[PDB]
Write a protein that binds this ligand. Structure first.
Ligand SMILES: COC(=O)[C@@H]1c2cc3c(c(O)c2[C@@H](O[C@@H]2O[C@@H](C)[C@H](O)[C@@](C)(O)[C@H]2OC)C[C@]1(C)O)C(=O)c1c(O)cccc1C3=O
Lengths: 131, 130
Protein backbone atom coordinates (compact mmCIF):
# COMPACT_ATOMS: atom_id res chain seq x y z
CA UNK A 1 0.00 0.00 0.00
CA UNK A 2 2.55 2.53 1.13
CA UNK A 3 5.02 0.80 -1.18
CA UNK A 4 2.62 0.93 -4.10
CA UNK A 5 1.78 4.55 -3.51
CA UNK A 6 5.44 5.47 -3.51
CA UNK A 7 6.03 3.66 -6.78
CA UNK A 8 3.10 5.52 -8.26
CA UNK A 9 4.73 8.78 -7.24
CA UNK A 10 8.00 7.80 -8.89
CA UNK A 11 6.10 7.01 -12.07
CA UNK A 12 4.72 10.56 -12.01
CA UNK A 13 8.18 11.91 -11.57
CA UNK A 14 9.37 9.80 -14.49
CA UNK A 15 6.55 11.19 -16.58
CA UNK A 16 7.58 14.75 -15.79
CA UNK A 17 11.16 13.73 -16.65
CA UNK A 18 10.12 12.70 -20.18
CA UNK A 19 8.03 15.85 -20.35
CA UNK A 20 4.76 13.96 -20.57
CA UNK A 21 2.03 15.72 -18.53
CA UNK A 22 -0.52 13.17 -19.54
CA UNK A 23 1.50 10.50 -17.80
CA UNK A 24 1.23 12.44 -14.55
CA UNK A 25 -2.55 13.02 -14.88
CA UNK A 26 -3.10 9.32 -15.51
CA UNK A 27 -2.72 8.68 -11.80
CA UNK A 28 -5.45 11.12 -10.76
CA UNK A 29 -8.79 10.04 -9.38
CA UNK A 30 -11.81 11.34 -11.23
CA UNK A 31 -12.70 13.46 -8.17
CA UNK A 32 -9.16 14.73 -7.47
CA UNK A 33 -8.72 18.02 -5.66
CA UNK A 34 -5.57 20.13 -5.99
CA UNK A 35 -4.95 22.86 -3.42
CA UNK A 36 -2.95 26.01 -4.10
CA UNK A 37 -0.65 27.86 -1.72
CA UNK A 38 -3.64 29.40 0.03
CA UNK A 39 -5.34 26.03 0.35
CA UNK A 40 -7.87 26.94 -2.28
CA UNK A 41 -8.81 24.23 -4.79
CA UNK A 42 -7.51 24.72 -8.35
CA UNK A 43 -9.56 23.17 -11.14
CA UNK A 44 -8.13 20.19 -13.04
CA UNK A 45 -8.26 22.32 -16.17
CA UNK A 46 -6.15 24.99 -14.63
CA UNK A 47 -3.75 22.55 -12.97
CA UNK A 48 -3.08 20.94 -16.32
CA UNK A 49 -2.67 24.33 -17.92
CA UNK A 50 0.00 25.24 -15.37
CA UNK A 51 1.79 21.94 -15.87
CA UNK A 52 1.79 22.35 -19.62
CA UNK A 53 3.13 25.91 -19.23
CA UNK A 54 5.98 24.70 -17.03
CA UNK A 55 7.10 22.10 -19.59
CA UNK A 56 6.89 24.83 -22.22
CA UNK A 57 8.98 27.20 -20.18
CA UNK A 58 11.47 24.57 -18.97
CA UNK A 59 11.55 21.94 -21.65
CA UNK A 60 14.79 20.36 -20.47
CA UNK A 61 13.65 20.08 -16.85
CA UNK A 62 14.85 17.31 -14.62
CA UNK A 63 13.41 16.39 -11.27
CA UNK A 64 15.59 14.83 -8.61
CA UNK A 65 13.73 13.16 -5.81
CA UNK A 66 15.74 14.16 -2.75
CA UNK A 67 13.59 12.28 -0.29
CA UNK A 68 10.34 10.35 -0.36
CA UNK A 69 8.33 9.14 2.62
CA UNK A 70 5.06 7.20 2.76
CA UNK A 71 2.72 6.32 5.57
CA UNK A 72 -0.88 5.22 5.32
CA UNK A 73 -2.59 6.82 2.35
CA UNK A 74 -0.02 9.66 1.95
CA UNK A 75 3.31 10.23 0.34
CA UNK A 76 5.50 13.32 0.58
CA UNK A 77 8.43 14.06 -1.65
CA UNK A 78 11.13 16.70 -1.52
CA UNK A 79 12.17 17.41 -5.10
CA UNK A 80 14.74 19.59 -6.78
CA UNK A 81 14.06 20.70 -10.31
CA UNK A 82 16.85 21.86 -12.65
CA UNK A 83 16.22 23.44 -16.03
CA UNK A 84 16.98 26.22 -18.48
CA UNK A 85 14.55 29.03 -18.90
CA UNK A 86 13.72 28.77 -22.58
CA UNK A 87 10.12 29.97 -22.59
CA UNK A 88 7.89 32.65 -21.20
CA UNK A 89 7.20 32.01 -17.61
CA UNK A 90 4.68 33.39 -15.20
CA UNK A 91 5.06 36.37 -17.41
CA UNK A 92 8.86 36.59 -17.33
CA UNK A 93 10.17 36.11 -20.84
CA UNK A 94 13.04 33.72 -21.54
CA UNK A 95 16.63 34.34 -20.37
CA UNK A 96 18.27 31.14 -21.44
CA UNK A 97 19.54 30.90 -17.89
CA UNK A 98 20.09 27.79 -15.84
CA UNK A 99 17.58 27.69 -12.96
CA UNK A 100 16.81 25.51 -10.05
CA UNK A 101 14.06 25.28 -7.41
CA UNK A 102 13.01 22.96 -4.66
CA UNK A 103 9.58 21.86 -3.58
CA UNK A 104 7.38 19.54 -1.60
CA UNK A 105 4.75 17.43 -3.31
CA UNK A 106 2.17 15.73 -1.11
CA UNK A 107 -0.30 13.19 -2.37
CA UNK A 108 -3.14 11.31 -0.77
CA UNK A 109 -4.32 8.14 -2.48
CA UNK A 110 -7.63 6.21 -2.60
CA UNK A 111 -7.70 2.55 -1.72
CA UNK A 112 -7.58 1.84 -5.45
CA UNK A 113 -4.31 3.79 -5.90
CA UNK A 114 -5.45 7.02 -7.48
CA UNK A 115 -4.59 10.53 -6.33
CA UNK A 116 -7.56 12.11 -4.55
CA UNK A 117 -5.93 15.14 -2.94
CA UNK A 118 -2.70 16.96 -3.82
CA UNK A 119 -0.75 19.74 -2.12
CA UNK A 120 2.61 21.34 -2.65
CA UNK A 121 5.01 23.95 -1.32
CA UNK A 122 7.23 25.70 -3.82
CA UNK A 123 10.26 27.77 -3.03
CA UNK A 124 10.53 29.83 -6.12
CA UNK A 125 12.92 32.30 -4.37
CA UNK A 126 16.03 31.05 -6.15
CA UNK A 127 14.13 31.34 -9.39
CA UNK A 128 12.79 34.89 -8.82
CA UNK A 129 16.13 36.14 -7.58
CA UNK A 130 17.82 34.64 -10.57
CA UNK A 131 15.26 36.00 -12.99
CA UNK B 1 10.82 4.18 16.18
CA UNK B 2 8.85 6.28 13.72
CA UNK B 3 6.01 6.72 16.17
CA UNK B 4 8.52 8.03 18.65
CA UNK B 5 10.17 10.29 16.04
CA UNK B 6 6.87 11.76 15.09
CA UNK B 7 6.06 12.65 18.71
CA UNK B 8 9.39 14.31 18.99
CA UNK B 9 8.48 16.43 16.00
CA UNK B 10 5.18 17.34 17.63
CA UNK B 11 7.21 18.37 20.71
CA UNK B 12 9.21 20.71 18.56
CA UNK B 13 6.02 22.26 17.18
CA UNK B 14 4.68 22.72 20.72
CA UNK B 15 7.91 24.45 21.70
CA UNK B 16 7.55 26.85 18.77
CA UNK B 17 3.95 27.54 19.77
CA UNK B 18 5.06 28.69 23.24
CA UNK B 19 7.83 30.63 21.56
CA UNK B 20 10.60 28.53 23.17
CA UNK B 21 13.44 28.03 20.58
CA UNK B 22 15.49 26.27 23.16
CA UNK B 23 12.86 23.54 23.29
CA UNK B 24 13.35 23.04 19.57
CA UNK B 25 17.16 22.99 19.81
CA UNK B 26 16.99 20.43 22.57
CA UNK B 27 16.18 17.78 20.03
CA UNK B 28 19.29 18.34 17.95
CA UNK B 29 22.18 15.91 17.96
CA UNK B 30 25.50 17.46 18.89
CA UNK B 31 26.66 16.94 15.30
CA UNK B 32 23.46 18.02 13.50
CA UNK B 33 23.61 19.33 9.97
CA UNK B 34 21.14 21.90 8.67
CA UNK B 35 20.83 22.68 5.00
CA UNK B 36 19.91 25.99 3.56
CA UNK B 37 17.81 26.67 0.55
CA UNK B 38 20.69 25.68 -1.82
CA UNK B 39 21.69 22.54 -0.01
CA UNK B 40 24.68 24.04 1.72
CA UNK B 41 25.18 23.37 5.42
CA UNK B 42 24.26 26.21 7.80
CA UNK B 43 25.80 26.43 11.22
CA UNK B 44 23.70 25.44 14.19
CA UNK B 45 24.49 28.86 15.62
CA UNK B 46 23.18 30.67 12.58
CA UNK B 47 20.01 28.53 12.54
CA UNK B 48 19.45 29.46 16.20
CA UNK B 49 19.86 33.07 15.29
CA UNK B 50 17.29 32.93 12.56
CA UNK B 51 14.86 31.10 14.81
CA UNK B 52 15.29 33.67 17.58
CA UNK B 53 14.66 36.48 15.17
CA UNK B 54 11.41 34.88 14.00
CA UNK B 55 10.10 34.59 17.55
CA UNK B 56 10.86 38.26 18.03
CA UNK B 57 9.46 39.36 14.72
CA UNK B 58 6.32 37.16 14.75
CA UNK B 59 5.69 37.00 18.47
CA UNK B 60 2.17 35.62 18.25
CA UNK B 61 3.04 32.96 15.75
CA UNK B 62 1.03 29.75 15.65
CA UNK B 63 1.94 26.58 13.79
CA UNK B 64 -0.66 24.08 12.74
CA UNK B 65 0.57 20.73 11.51
CA UNK B 66 -1.34 20.06 8.30
CA UNK B 67 0.12 16.58 7.78
CA UNK B 68 2.91 14.47 9.15
CA UNK B 69 4.42 11.28 7.73
CA UNK B 70 7.09 9.08 9.23
CA UNK B 71 9.00 6.28 7.57
CA UNK B 72 12.25 4.73 8.78
CA UNK B 73 14.49 7.36 10.24
CA UNK B 74 12.68 10.30 8.61
CA UNK B 75 9.76 12.58 9.27
CA UNK B 76 8.19 15.11 6.95
CA UNK B 77 5.66 17.68 8.11
CA UNK B 78 3.68 20.29 6.18
CA UNK B 79 3.04 23.13 8.54
CA UNK B 80 1.19 26.41 8.33
CA UNK B 81 2.37 29.41 10.33
CA UNK B 82 0.05 32.32 11.02
CA UNK B 83 1.25 35.44 12.80
CA UNK B 84 1.36 39.18 12.87
CA UNK B 85 4.46 40.76 11.46
CA UNK B 86 5.60 42.96 14.35
CA UNK B 87 9.38 42.97 14.13
CA UNK B 88 12.15 43.24 11.52
CA UNK B 89 12.87 39.84 9.94
CA UNK B 90 15.72 39.25 7.42
CA UNK B 91 15.81 42.87 6.62
CA UNK B 92 12.11 43.08 6.14
CA UNK B 93 10.49 45.75 8.24
CA UNK B 94 7.27 45.05 10.12
CA UNK B 95 4.01 45.79 8.40
CA UNK B 96 1.87 45.06 11.41
CA UNK B 97 -0.32 42.84 9.24
CA UNK B 98 -1.47 39.27 9.47
CA UNK B 99 0.82 36.94 7.52
CA UNK B 100 0.55 33.27 6.81
CA UNK B 101 2.83 30.77 5.08
CA UNK B 102 3.00 27.00 4.62
CA UNK B 103 6.18 24.95 4.60
CA UNK B 104 7.90 21.61 4.77
CA UNK B 105 10.14 20.43 7.53
CA UNK B 106 12.09 17.23 6.97
CA UNK B 107 13.98 15.68 9.85
CA UNK B 108 16.33 12.67 9.95
CA UNK B 109 16.85 11.02 13.34
CA UNK B 110 19.63 9.01 14.87
CA UNK B 111 18.77 5.67 16.45
CA UNK B 112 18.63 7.38 19.84
CA UNK B 113 16.05 9.85 18.50
CA UNK B 114 18.07 13.03 18.07
CA UNK B 115 17.91 15.14 14.93
CA UNK B 116 21.02 14.56 12.75
CA UNK B 117 19.97 16.19 9.50
CA UNK B 118 17.40 18.84 8.77
CA UNK B 119 15.93 20.33 5.60
CA UNK B 120 13.14 22.91 5.02
CA UNK B 121 11.17 24.12 2.00
CA UNK B 122 9.57 27.55 2.42
CA UNK B 123 7.26 29.66 0.27
CA UNK B 124 7.96 33.00 1.93
CA UNK B 125 6.30 34.97 -0.83
CA UNK B 126 3.64 36.35 1.53
CA UNK B 127 6.43 38.25 3.25
CA UNK B 128 7.59 39.92 0.04
CA UNK B 129 5.06 39.51 -2.65
CA UNK B 130 4.61 43.32 -2.78
C1 LIG C 1 7.98 29.46 12.72
O1 LIG C 1 9.27 29.50 12.13
C2 LIG C 1 9.29 29.37 10.77
O2 LIG C 1 8.26 29.39 10.06
C3 LIG C 1 10.58 29.26 10.20
C4 LIG C 1 11.34 28.15 10.70
C5 LIG C 1 10.73 27.00 11.17
C6 LIG C 1 11.44 25.91 11.66
C7 LIG C 1 12.82 25.97 11.69
C8 LIG C 1 13.45 27.10 11.18
O3 LIG C 1 14.79 27.14 11.21
C9 LIG C 1 12.78 28.20 10.69
C10 LIG C 1 13.51 29.31 10.18
O4 LIG C 1 14.20 28.88 8.97
C11 LIG C 1 15.53 29.31 8.86
O5 LIG C 1 15.67 30.67 8.57
C12 LIG C 1 15.17 31.12 7.40
C13 LIG C 1 15.40 32.65 7.24
C14 LIG C 1 15.92 30.44 6.30
O6 LIG C 1 15.35 30.89 5.05
C15 LIG C 1 15.80 29.00 6.43
C16 LIG C 1 14.44 28.48 6.06
O7 LIG C 1 16.71 28.44 5.47
C17 LIG C 1 16.17 28.53 7.76
O8 LIG C 1 17.54 28.81 7.90
C18 LIG C 1 18.13 27.63 8.38
C19 LIG C 1 12.73 30.53 9.79
C20 LIG C 1 11.36 30.60 10.52
C21 LIG C 1 10.58 31.86 10.12
O9 LIG C 1 11.59 30.68 11.98
C22 LIG C 1 13.56 24.92 12.21
O10 LIG C 1 14.82 24.97 12.22
C23 LIG C 1 12.93 23.82 12.68
C24 LIG C 1 13.66 22.76 13.19
O11 LIG C 1 14.98 22.92 13.22
C25 LIG C 1 13.07 21.63 13.69
C26 LIG C 1 11.68 21.55 13.65
C27 LIG C 1 10.91 22.59 13.18
C28 LIG C 1 11.54 23.73 12.67
C29 LIG C 1 10.78 24.78 12.15
O12 LIG C 1 9.53 24.70 12.12
Amino acid sequence: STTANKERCLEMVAAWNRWDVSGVVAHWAPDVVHYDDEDKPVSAEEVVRRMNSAVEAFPDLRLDVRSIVGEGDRVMLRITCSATHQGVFMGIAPTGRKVRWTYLEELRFSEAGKVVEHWDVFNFSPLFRDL
